[PDB]
């Protein structure tokens, strides 16, 4: 789906598989978080379903030792003094030793501050221990987490249930037409993008000799030239769009290991799973009720939340017993109006637009010479039109799909292309869709705050700040303190600070709250990026203070207060809202669950081969299932006819469903249901 998703895949740790255990055999012990998992296996990252606890992610700093166990880095302490010498310890090895926590205060030389410090001991037991007895200490605070876990700002403010989803959803983010880095980060966003392998890094240092949309050419120091080719509009496994664009301009001095061209969900080499949205935490006319989400039409018009999706359609020409399938522009009984967007071969032309039901690859096959209908024979003598022996077997666009034809790939057996035994010509047609955001589309933050788009209001209906700026997204207040994920609150506060900028007051000295604050942050520009590393980063003290330091807008007016709230005007009534509303900036990702995929419906269609019941799935144009649980509800209603109807004529009554169609289009009444063909199968299976 995105770069990060691929990375997470390469680091997943499964118990499932041959030689391992089954899902049913696994009890409640195998799944829960073990004390040894510290710094080796992430305790947050795991699936939410029946797979839970059986699938995890390898921790950030850990590595695998030549015996197949999981080691992890710890800092060595000789005698109360931290040493930069690092040794990797296995799980049982760590048990024999005693580990101090990472955040324990350390002398500038390397000594401990307090005699008794926080200590990790075998069997997951904790106690205070004099500094004389400390063997090792942790490498980093964020040592226990995975790569996906670490990108959740203010993680220690979100409960393990929403933090879990927060990590399990980042993988599900869709690459956008163009991507922005988040205003609020944790620092991980850089290394993650680079290691993923869906960006372009410079191997050897040098200078940009020539740059194009197609490729980048780098002139090394030693004289040799290495050229990197850009992936442009390529279909991913999941139909998302991996499109790389050069960062550097021609003649730029570039050093080795630097990002010169990023890919999908990447801004200047940083993981960019979403956009920076102006949020407003208030109920609004019941349209954001029960985790629904309200949008500004701005996000539609400015393609802020827009993405491309590419499909791969395929079809072949085989040898049959009645001859051989040939791909031709001549399809029986079709106007030249439909064949308009075809070339002389029979294939669609690049650049053409295609809708559902339209022709992509016109292929015809010889049909069996069976005695044609005496009623159709008669109909062919009147109009004197001799029947062709070729049946239409063309590739038409599946229901729902649509877009521009962005490439054709032809393989011919004639042109020596090695095809499987029996095939002659094989055509692939790639169609892309520029899907704008719409109602029902699933949006999410990093803190397990999901939701689908309820209503997209016109830009003027939006509750706006004093200077006229209309907000972007209107999250409901009710669904915040229940989920124990108030990180989204802290992200919003710091988000406004990161957008307006700030300046701490240095007059009468550096304030006591911003005393621990690093010098570089004491003054900030509008639209500035920051890092809030997990188990470190901003504290609620510094955050409250920064709300006071918020720089005024272009009109010299402050917009939000020290509470972090601001006054809103209802874009509908005009009257300003009676109470202060929490307003700020929050990072939101467009997840890969869009209505344009999810919607499906069926009148009639194909049917099963044995049970003669309707097939199942959107890919098979199937019908829904009225299961055993759903029958009980009908019976509990007393709707005997509705229940009978569904399981009879609407399903596997061979003669029924045929005579129901007739009765409807002729505008008559529905006939009495017959015998289920599936039941007839049972009596034969018993016999």
């Amino acid at each position: 789906n995105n770069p990060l998703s691929g990375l997470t895949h390469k680091r997943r740790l499964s118990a499932l598989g041959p030689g391992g255990l089954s899902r049913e055999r696994a009890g409640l012990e195998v799944r829960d978080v073990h004390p040894s998992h510290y710094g080796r296996m992430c305790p947050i990252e795991t699936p939410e379903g029946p797979n839970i606890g059986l699938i995890g992610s390898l921790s950030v700093y850990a590595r695998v030792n030549p015996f197949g166990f999981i080691e992890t880095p710890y800092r060595k302490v000789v005698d109360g003094v931290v040493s930069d010498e690092i040794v990797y310890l296995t799980a049982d090895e760590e048990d024999r030793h005693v580990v101090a926590q990472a955040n324990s205060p350390i002398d500038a030389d390397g000594r401990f501050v307090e005699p008794r410090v926080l200590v990790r001991r075998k069997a997951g037991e904790v106690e205070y221990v004099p500094s004389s007895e400390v063997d090792y200490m942790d490498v980093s605070p964020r040592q226990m987490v995975s790569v996906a876990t670490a990108m959740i700002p203010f993680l220690e403010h979100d409960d393990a249930n929403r933090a879990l989803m927060g990590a399990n959803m980042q993988r599900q983010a869709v690459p956008l037409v163009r991507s922005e880095a988040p205003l609020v980060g944790t620092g991980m966003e850089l290394r993650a993008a680079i290691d993923a392998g869906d960006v372009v890094v410079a191997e050897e240092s040098g200078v940009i000799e020539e740059v194009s949309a197609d490729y980048i050419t780098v002139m090394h120091d030693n004289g040799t030239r290495r050229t990197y080719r850009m992936r442009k509009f390529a279909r991913s496994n999941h139909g998302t769009c991996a499109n790389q664009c050069p960062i550097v301009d021609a003649g730029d001095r570039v050093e080795a290991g630097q990002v010169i061209a990023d890919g999908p969900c990447t801004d200047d080499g940083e993981m960019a799973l979403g956009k920076n949205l102006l949020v407003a935490i208030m109920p609004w006319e019941g349209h954001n009720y029960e985790d629904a989400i309200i949008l500004s039409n701005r996000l539609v018009e400015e393609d802020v939340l827009t993405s491309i999706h590419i499909e791969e359609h395929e079809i072949d020409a085989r040898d049959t017993k009645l001859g051989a399938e040939e791909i031709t522009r001549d399809i029986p009984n079709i106007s030249d109006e439909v064949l308009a967007d075809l070339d002389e071969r029979g294939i669609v032309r690049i650049g053409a637009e295609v809708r559902d039901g339209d022709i992509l690859v016109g292929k015809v096959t010889p049909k069996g010479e069976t005695e044609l209908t005496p009623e159709e024979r008669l109909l062919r003598a009147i109009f004197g039109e001799k029947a062709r022996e070729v049946r239409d077997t063309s590739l038409k666009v599946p229901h729902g799909e649509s877009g521009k034809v962005i490439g054709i790939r032809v393989f011919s057996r004639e042109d020596e292309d090695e095809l499987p035994a029996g095939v002659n010509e094989l055509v692939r047609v790639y169609v892309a869709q520029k899907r704008k955001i719409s109602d029902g589309d699933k949006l999410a933050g990093r803190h397990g705050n999901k939701g689908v788009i309820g209503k997209i209001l016109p830009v003027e209906d939006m509750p706006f700040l004093a200077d006229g700026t209309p907000v972007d997204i209107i999250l409901n207040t009710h669904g915040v303190p229940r989920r124990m994920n108030i990180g989204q609150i802290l992200e919003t506060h710091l988000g406004w600070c990161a957008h307006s900028g700030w300046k701490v007051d240095a007059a009468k000295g550096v304030p006591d709250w911003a005393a621990r604050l690093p010098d570089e942050l004491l003054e900030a520009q509008p639209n500035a990026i920051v890092s809030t590393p997990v188990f470190d980063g901003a504290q609620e003290a510094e955050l409250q203070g920064l709300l006071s330091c918020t720089l005024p807008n272009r009109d010299g007016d402050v917009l939000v207060d020290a509470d972090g709230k601001a006054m809103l005007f209802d874009g509908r009534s005009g009257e300003p809202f009676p109470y202060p509303v929490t307003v700020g900036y929050m990072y939101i990702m467009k997840l890969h669950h869009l209505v344009d995929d999810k919607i499906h419906a069926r009148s009639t269609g194909p049917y099963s081969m044995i049970t003669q019941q309707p097939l199942g799935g959107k890919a098979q144009f199937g019908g829904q299932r009225f299961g055993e649980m759903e029958c009980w509800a009908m019976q509990a209603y007393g709707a005997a006819y509705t229940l009978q109807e569904l399981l009879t004529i609407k399903s596997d009554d061979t003669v029924g469903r045929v005579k129901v169609y007739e009765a409807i289009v002729k505008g008559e009444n529905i006939p009495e249901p017959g015998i289920p063909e599936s039941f007839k199968v049972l009596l034969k299976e018993l016999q």
Binding site: Y61, S531, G537
Partner: peptide, 23 residues
């Protein structure tokens, strides 16, 4: 700064100094 190693955009970090080892 957080990761002053490749040639990356500067992201200012609230932090205790983290110099044990790079990811």
């Amino acid at each position: 700064s957080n990761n002053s190693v490749p040639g990356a955009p500067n992201r200012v970090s609230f932090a205790k100094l983290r110099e044990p080892l790079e990811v």
